[PDB]
C-alpha cells in the first residue's frame, strides 16, 4: 500500500505484428465490448483483460482507493518474444518500451518503467538498455526466467549483466514460458506451479552459475517470492554440499552464502509464506508486489503485509516502500 | 530417530532383464568393488551405492548407532518401470515385493514393506496390491507422482484408489520420472528442483482431481515435505478461487480444505521449513522420513526434529513414530 | 549527588498487551540489539533505551562512580495510560508496581519506589494507592499533569487526594500527554517546551481548584523545576487579583500565597535558572532529580548543585538528598 | 516611564467588516454606554474596554500622570484576521494601519505605530509593509506568534522577514491564537499559560527555524518577557544538544548562541524574574512595555524597574527608553 | 483447602549459575515451547515444568478454582545446591529468597515465604536466616533432609537450629538428594520409596541427636506425613530400648516422648494413612500440605481431609489451616 | 503363641568354608561361654549370639514357657552368601538345609524348616528347591529381598517362581544386605530404616515386575509387617497412576489391586500399627513372626497381638496359627 513493484500495462493498441514482420505468433489486443478486451495469439483468446490493463486514469483511480503510491509498470511477460528474429523482438521491444515511458512522462510521481529487451540477442539487448536507462529514465527492466534454451547462468548473457551492473540498472525476474502442453494443461498448473517451479529454477541458475559472484553490485528482483527457493533452499543447500562434482562446477560457494544478495516480491497470498519468506530472505530484501491487474495477484495491495502481527512498523514499511526504492535506486523524493 | 517412513533398498542381484522380457532400458545392479556397486541404466553409471543399499544386516547396525528403530522399506524409485510393458512390469515388481518380503520375515520388529505397483496398468496393479496386503503383510505401496501420460487425476487409476482404500493400504507417494535433459542436465536440477516440483504436481492432482474428496478413507504420504505445496498452497488456493473454470470441473473443494486429509514426510533439511511444514500439514501429519541410505537425505535421522526448540516431548514423539504409526495403521508394540 | 527522584525503570519483559487486552496503543520493549532496546507504540519506535533502562545492576554501578545514595523509582510516563479501559490500566499499574516493589526488593538501601495508579478510575486509583503504601511498601506514586479531560482540579479527583493525605503517599506529578502532532511535531518542541506548559497548567490547577487548600497535608512534587512557573508566578499572581470571576471561583487564596506549599526537582540546567528556582521554591522545596537515563536529563547527577557558588554548603546538602528525605518521609539512617 | 513598547489601541469605530467581506467571524466595537465599549465576535462579549482604548486625548491624560513619554501604538492582538481571506484582512490591515498613523500625526511626539499585515499572504503582507514603512512612517509592524499552520520557522515568511531587515522594520511579535477551549477554558489559562507557551515557541521557532542567522540584522522584539524562554532556555539548550537529529536540521547553531540577537519586553511583574530575564537576555535587549490598557499588564509603568534593588540608573535608563529607541531606530528628539 | 504448607516455585528465569560461579552443576530453566519450561542440570532435561511452576498471576487462578487460601511457598529442593561452594550457594539463596519476598509481597493475604539457606556453611546459613526474618519477613525457612555428609543430628549444625529457635523461624524439612542410580534407577524408586526414607532417617537423626531436646521450643515440620515414621515407629522405639548403645549415646529418651514436638504435612494419599498419621503425631501437629504443582502431589487440596469421615469439624479445620498457622506462628486474621 | 513364622537358627558348628571354597568373606561361629557365642567375617565380631541360636531343647524349652507351638526355622540372613561363586552357595545352603531337617527330625512337632537357596545361579536354585521340598519335606524357603544387583523383579529369577509355584513352596522374604557404611552408620540405622526400606523395594519390585500376575498361585510373605509398605501403598500407587511410563512398562495394574494377593509378619511392635497392618493387608493375610531369638524382634510372642481388643478371638487365632498354616500349606493336626 505504497509501492507495486509488480505489475503489467500494455498499450490499447498496436500495429498488426504479423503484417509488420511477415510471420505469425505474436499477440494482438481486440476491443469488443466497453472496458474489455482479449488478447489473441494467432487464433485462441489467450486472456481476456479489463480497461485498467491499459488505461493509466483508470490505473490511477484504482491505485488511489487501494493507498498505492506508485506502481513499477512492465509489459505482460507474453510479450517477451525471445524466439522471434533478433530485430524484430527489438522493434516491438522500442515500441513496447516507448509507450511505458509516456505513460510514466505523463504521471511521473505515480509511475516508474521497467522496459523488455530482445535477450535472444545479447548486443541487442544492450543497446536498448542502455536506452531504457539513458533515454528514458527506466531505473531497470524487467526479463524472463530463460531465454529459449538459455537458463540466466548462460555465459552469453554475461554481456547483458555486464551493462546492467555498469548503467545501475536493475532486472526485475518474471517467469514465462512454462510448459503449457501434455501433463501441464490442466487445472491452471503453468500458473499455480510451473511459475513457481521457473523462479526457483532461475535463482538456482544465476547461483550456482556463478553469476552474483561475478557481478556482486547487480539488482535482481524475482516474481511471486522466489517461487519455491524459500522453503526448498534447504535440499538445494544440502545437495551442493552432497555432489560438487554436480553443482559446483561453475562457483564453489554454496548457495546459502547467496541469501541476501537478491530481493523477491511479496507476492504469496499466506501469512505463513510471507513470514518464512522475510526469515529466509531477509526484511530488507521483500518488496511488495502485486502482479496488478491479473486475478492471480493480490486484489488487496499491501494487505497481507499489513495484517502482519509480527511484523513492526519499520518492517511493514521496508516491505511497502522501503526496500522497492533501495532496489529501484530512487529516492522517496519523487513520489 | 524412532521411525524411518522413507528409505530405499534393492536385492543384491537380479537377473538381466534385458534378456528375460526382450527390450532393454532396464537397470542392474553390478557388484564392481568390495561392499559397493553401481547402477547401470543402459550403458551408464545412473549411481553408486554401498552395501547399506542391499544389506539388511548392514542396514540394522546402521539403524543401532542411529537410534531408528523401524525402517520403512521402499524400492529406488528407478524401478518403478512404468514406461514398460505391463506384463513385464507386473513380473519385476513381483520380483521387488517377494525380496522385501523375505527382508521383512528376517527382522519383523525393525522392518516394514510398502510393495511397488505396475500402475500403468490399473487391473494389474489391484491384483499385486492385493497381494502385497493379502499375502506379503505389507501396510502399503510406493508409487511415482505420475505414470507415464497420466497425472494423479487419472480416472484410469480410479480403481487403483478404491482398492487401497478397501484393502486399508497406505500409499506413499515418491517424485520419479522428472525432466532429466535439456535445460534440467545441469546443476543436479532433477534432484534438487524437478522432484519437488512433480510432489507439488502430485498434490495439486490428486486435490483437484478430486481423489481425496472420493475416497476419504484413502492414506496417503507424500515426500520430501510435499515439495513445494507448504509454501506455495496460498497461491494454488487463490488461484482455484479466482479460475474454477480451470481448476473446478472435477471437484469443487478448495484445496485448503485437504489441509490436515494427508500426510508429508518431514524431509526438508531447515528447521524454518519444518517449522512451517508442521504449521501448514499439522503436527498429526508430519512423519520423520530420511531417504536412506542416499546422501541428499538426512544424514543423521530426527536431528532436525530433535533440534526443533519450539517443539515439546510429544510433538517431537508424533513426528518421530506416533504419525508413522498411524499412517501405516500400526501399533507400537510390535515394534 | 546524595538521592535522585526522578528515575525511570521499565520491567525487562512484559506480555503483549495488545493480545492481554484487546486493543491496541500500547508498548512494548523490543530487544533489538547489544544492550539496547526500542519502545515500540504499535510497532512504531518512540525512544529508544540501553540496559540501564531494566537492569538494576546496571544501574547500581552507574549510580556508583556518578556518587548517587539512592533513586526513587518510578515508571516511564507514557506507560501511564489513563487512556485505556479503567481495569486493563488498573492490571498494567499491579504489573509495574510489582515488579518497581521486587527491584527495591533487592537493593533496599538503593532504591525506592514510586508507584503507578490508574488515574481515571479515581475509586480503582484509591485501592491501587493503598496497596502500594500499605503492602509494597513505596514512600509515594508518581503521576500525568493531566488525565484525559480532567486537569489536578477535578473534584473527581478528590478522594485520591484524600486517600494520598491519609496514607501519606507522597505525590510526584510528571507532565505528559502534551500535544505531539500538528505545530508541535518539529523541533522536539512537545518535550522542550510542551512539557513545561504541562507542568505550569498542573501546579496553576492545584492552587486555582483549591486542592492545596482541601488538603494541607498533601506533598506534591513537580518535575523539572515546576516548568515554567517559578518565572511566570507573577504573570499568574497578577492575573488572578485582576480576574477573581475567572480564577477564583474555586479557590480565593492567591497563587502566590502557595510559593512554600509544594516541591519541584531541581531539573533546570542552568545555575540562573536553578537560582531563580530556589529563590521562589524555597531552599527546602527543591529537589535533586535527574530524569535518569533519559538524555534531556542532567548527566552528571548534583554537578549543577555543587557549581553554585551562591549556595553555602548546607543548602547544597538540602538540595542533594535532605529535602528529598522530607518529602517521602524517611530517615537517612536506612540509606 | 519612557517609553511604552507594548500599547493596544482600535479605531473609536469601523464598519460591520461581515457586511463588507461577506462572511462573520470578524470583532466590532459597540460603545454601549459611558467610556465603556465592547468588543464583539459574534454573540459573545470578548472583552469590556474603556475610552483609554481609542480616545487618544484621554491616552494622553494617564501617560502624563504615570510619566510616560511615549506609546507604541499597536492594533488589539484579536484584530490580526490571519484565518480569513488574504485580500479582506489587507482592506482591514490598510484601515487599521491608516488609522493608526492619524493618531500618531495627532501626537507625533507621543506614540509611534506599530502596523499590522496580512501575514497569511506573503506577497501582501511586504506590500503594506513598504506602505507602512514608506508612507506612513512607521518604525515597525507588530505580527502574531505564528500564521495558522505557519510557525514563525516557516520558509513562507522569509520574504517578509527579508523586507523587513531591507527597510529596517523592527518586528514585535504578539502571542495569539492560543487554544481557548477544552481544559484551557478555565482560570483564564490561555492568557496566564498559553500566550507566554506561544511566546516560547515563536523564538524557538525563529531561532531553529535559522531566521535570525539568514537575517542577521533583523530587528525582533517578543512580548511578555520571551514567555518561559528566559527560565527555560537551559531545557531547550540542553535538548538542542542532546537531540541534533530532530532540533537542528534547519539552523545546526545552539540556541543560546542567539541570547543577544533579539529583544523582549519587561512585562513579568515580577522582581525575581525581571532580573533573570535581563541576565539572560541582557540590559540592552529588553524594552519597557506595558499591555496598556488592559488589566493583566502593568498598572504603574515602570515602577517594577524602578524599584530594582540589583540595578544601576544606567541600566534603569535602559529598559525605560534607551533599549526601545535602539529597538525601533529612532532618536530621542523625536521626543 | 485453607493453607497448604508444601508448594514449590522457581523464578522465571536466573543468570548463568556456571557462568557467573566458575564451574557447572548447577539448574537452569529453558524456556522453549509455550507453557511449559525444561529443568536442565549439566547435560541432561531432568524434569518438565509448567507455568504454575513460576508464574503467581497463574497459581492464584488454580487456588481460586481449589479453594486454596494461601500456599507457603519454597524453591524446588533441586536448587539447594548445598555441595557448592558457601559463598556461592549464599549467592544463590539470596537470589532465591528475595523473588520469594517479591512474590509474597504482590499477593500478601495469598503466599508466605520460606527460604533457603546455605546449609553447609553453618555461619553463612544463620545469617541469611537473619536476613529472611529480619528482613525479608519470611516466618520460616525449608532445609533438607541432609547435608551433604551431614544427617541432621550433625553438631556443625547446631548454631542454625539455636538461630532459628531464637528467632521463631520454623523449619520445613524435605527430603532431597537420594540415590537415583544402581537399583533405585526403575519404578519411580526414588521418589515413592528413596523419599520417605530420607525423611524417615532425618527424624531419627533428629530425635536420638537430642535436637529436639536441647532446643525444645524449635518448630520443625516433615514432608510427606513424615515417611514410613508413622508405621515404623514402633520398631525404631523398640530398637532404641534394645540398643541403647547405639541408639541412646547422644539423647536417653526413647523416639516415642517426641511425639507431639513436631509437624508433619499430611500428604500420605491413603485415608488409613492419614488416620494413622493423627493417631500418632497428634490431630494439633499434622498439616494439610500439597506438593503442588508436581503430580505425586495431592491434585484436589484439602480432598482427603475433607473425606475423612471420623473427624469433626474443628478436627478438619486444624488439618487444613489452624494447624499451620500455629507451626508458622501466623494468625488466621492476616488472610 | 501358636505358630512363629519368622525365627533364624544356625547349626552348632560347620567347616572352614574359606578352606572349603577357595576364598574368604564367609562367617563361621565360635563359642565363649558355655552358651554363649560369636559370629566371625573373616576376623571379626558384628554378633553375640547365645545357646538358643544351635541349640533346639533350649528352644523348645523357651517355646514352652512361652506359648510357642511352632517355629518355622530359617537360616540367618548373613548366610544367604548370594555374593560367593554359585557352586560354592549351592553346597553350603545344602549343609544349612539338611542341619535344618536334622532339628526338624528330632521335633516334627514343633518346628517347620524354612530352606535357603543358591539366588545368584537360578538353575542351580530350582535343583536345590526341589530337593528341600521333595526330599526335604520343607514348606518353603527363606530369600533375601535382592540377589547382588537382581531385585526380585528380575527376570534371570522367574524360573525360580515358576519352580516354587510348582512345588507349592512358599516364599519368604527377609531383608539383608542394607548399607551398612555412610550415613547409616549410626543409631542404628541399618536395622530401624534400612531393612524396612528393602522390604519396601522388594514388594513393589514384586508387584511392578509383574510376579504376582505371572504367578497367581505363589505364595510370598514378607518380614518385619511389609516394611514402610502398608503406610507408603498410597503413595506408591498414586505416582504408579502419575507416571506409568516410569513405573508401568513392566506390569500395567495398579499396586493397589495387590493387596491381599501376599502375606506380611505382624512383627510392628505397635497396636496402631498392627492394626493398620490387618486393614491394609487383610486379617488373612497377616502371620505371627517374632525373630527369635534377636532382641529386635518380639520378646512376649503374641502379646501385642492378644492385647488388640479389637479383634476378636478368631481374628486372632488366624494372625496366631491359621494364616501361617494357610501360608505354608500345612493342617492343623500336624501340631
Ligand atoms: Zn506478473
Ligand atoms: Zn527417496
Ligand atoms: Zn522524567
Ligand atoms: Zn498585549
Ligand atoms: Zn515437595
Ligand atoms: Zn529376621
Same mark, same amino acid.
Given at each position: 500500500?505504497?509501492?507495486?513493484?509488480?505489475?503489467?500495462?500494455?498499450?490499447?493498441?498496436?500495429?498488426?505484428?504479423?503484417?509488420?514482420?511477415?510471420?505469425?505468433?505474436?499477440?494482438?489486443?481486440?476491443?469488443?465490448?466497453?472496458?474489455?478486451?482479449?488478447?489473441?495469439?494467432?487464433?485462441?483468446?489467450?486472456?481476456?483483460?479489463?480497461? =485498467?490493463?491499459?488505461?493509466?486514469?483508470?490505473?490511477?483511480?484504482?491505485?488511489?482507493? *487501494?493507498?498505492?503510491?506508485?506502481?513499477?509498470?512492465?509489459?505482460?511477460?507474453?510479450?517477451?518474444?525471445?524466439?522471434? *528474429?533478433?530485430?524484430?523482438?527489438? =522493434?516491438?521491444?522500442?515500441?513496447?518500451?516507448?509507450?511505458?515511458?509516456?505513460?510514466?512522462?505523463?504521471?511521473?510521481?505515480?509511475?516508474?518503467?521497467?522496459?523488455?529487451?530482445?535477450?535472444?540477442?545479447?548486443?541487442?539487448?544492450?543497446?536498448?538498455?542502455?536506452?531504457?536507462?539513458?533515454?528514458?529514465?527506466?531505473?531497470?527492466?524487467?526479463?524472463?526466467?530463460?531465454?529459449?534454451?538459455?537458463?540466466?547462468?548462460?555465459?552469453?548473457?554475461?554481456?547483458?549483466?555486464?551493462?546492467?551492473?555498469?548503467? *545501475?540498472?536493475?532486472?526485475?525476474?518474471?517467469?514465462?514460458?512454462?510448459?503449457?502442453?501434455?501433463?501441464?494443461?490442466?487445472?491452471?498448473?503453468?500458473?499455480?506451479?510451473?511459475?513457481?517451479?521457473?523462479?526457483?529454477?532461475?535463482?538456482?541458475?544465476?547461483?550456482?552459475?556463478?553469476?552474483?559472484?561475478?557481478?556482486?553490485?547487480?539488482?535482481?528482483?524475482?516474481?511471486?517470492?522466489?517461487?519455491?527457493?524459500?522453503?526448498?533452499?534447504?535440499?538445494?543447500?544440502?545437495?551442493?554440499?552432497?555432489?560438487?562434482?554436480?553443482?559446483?562446477?561453475?562457483?564453489?560457494?554454496?548457495?546459502?552464502?547467496?541469501?541476501?544478495?537478491?530481493?523477491?516480491?511479496?507476492?504469496?497470498?499466506?501469512?505463513?509464506?510471507?513470514?518464512?519468506?522475510?526469515?529466509?530472505?531477509?526484511?530488507?530484501?521483500?518488496?511488495?508486489?502485486?502482479?496488478?491487474?491479473?486475478?492471480?495477484?493480490?486484489?488487496?495491495?499491501?494487505?497481507?503485509?499489513?495484517?502482519?502481527?509480527?511484523?513492526?512498523?519499520?518492517? *511493514?514499511?521496508?516491505?511497502?516502500?522501503?526496500?522497492?526504492?533501495?532496489?529501484?535506486?530512487?529516492?522517496?523524493?519523487?513520489?
Amino acid at each position: 500500500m505504497k509501492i507495486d513493484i509488480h505489475s503489467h500495462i500494455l498499450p490499447k493498441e498496436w500495429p498488426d505484428l504479423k503484417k509488420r514482420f511477415g510471420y505469425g505468433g505474436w499477440v494482438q489486443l481486440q476491443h469488443h465490448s466497453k472496458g474489455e478486451a482479449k488478447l489473441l495469439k494467432d487464433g485462441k483468446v489467450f486472456r481476456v483483460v479489463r480497461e =485498467n490493463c491499459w488505461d493509466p486514469e483508470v490505473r490511477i483511480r484504482e491505485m488511489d482507493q *487501494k493507498g498505492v503510491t506508485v506502481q513499477a509498470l512492465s509489459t505482460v511477460p507474453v510479450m517477451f518474444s525471445y524466439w522471434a *528474429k533478433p530485430e524484430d523482438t527489438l =522493434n516491438l521491444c522500442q515500441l513496447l518500451n516507448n509507450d511505458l515511458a509516456s505513460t510514466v512522462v505523463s504521471y511521473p510521481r505515480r509511475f516508474v518503467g521497467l522496459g523488455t529487451l530482445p535477450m535472444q540477442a545479447p548486443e541487442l539487448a544492450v543497446k536498448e538498455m542502455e536506452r531504457c536507462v539513458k533515454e528514458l529514465g527506466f531505473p531497470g527492466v524487467q526479463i524472463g526466467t530463460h531465454v529459449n534454451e538459455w537458463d540466466l547462468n548462460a555465459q552469453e548473457l554475461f554481456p547483458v549483466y555486464a551493462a546492467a551492473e555498469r548503467l *545501475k540498472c536493475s532486472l526485475f525476474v518474471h517467469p514465462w514460458d512454462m510448459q503449457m502442453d501434455g501433463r501441464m494443461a490442466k487445472y491452471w498448473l503453468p500458473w499455480l506451479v510451473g511459475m513457481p517451479a521457473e523462479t526457483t529454477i532461475a535463482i538456482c541458475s544465476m547461483i550456482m552459475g556463478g553469476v552474483f559472484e561475478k557481478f556482486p553490485k547487480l539488482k535482481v528482483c524475482f516474481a511471486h517470492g522466489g517461487g519455491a527457493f524459500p522453503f526448498t533452499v534447504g535440499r538445494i543447500s544440502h545437495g551442493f554440499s552432497m555432489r560438487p562434482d554436480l553443482c559446483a562446477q561453475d562457483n564453489p560457494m554454496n548457495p546459502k552464502k547467496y541469501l541476501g544478495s537478491f530481493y523477491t516480491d511479496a507476492l504469496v497470498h499466506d501469512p505463513l509464506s510471507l513470514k518464512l519468506l522475510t526469515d529466509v530472505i531477509g526484511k530488507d530484501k521483500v518488496i511488495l508486489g502485486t502482479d496488478y491487474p491479473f486475478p492471480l495477484g493480490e486484489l488487496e495491495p499491501g494487505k497481507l503485509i499489513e495484517s502482519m502481527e509480527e511484523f513492526d512498523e519499520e518492517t *511493514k514499511n521496508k516491505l511497502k516502500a522501503g526496500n522497492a526504492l533501495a532496489f529501484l535506486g530512487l529516492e522517496r523524493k519523487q513520489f
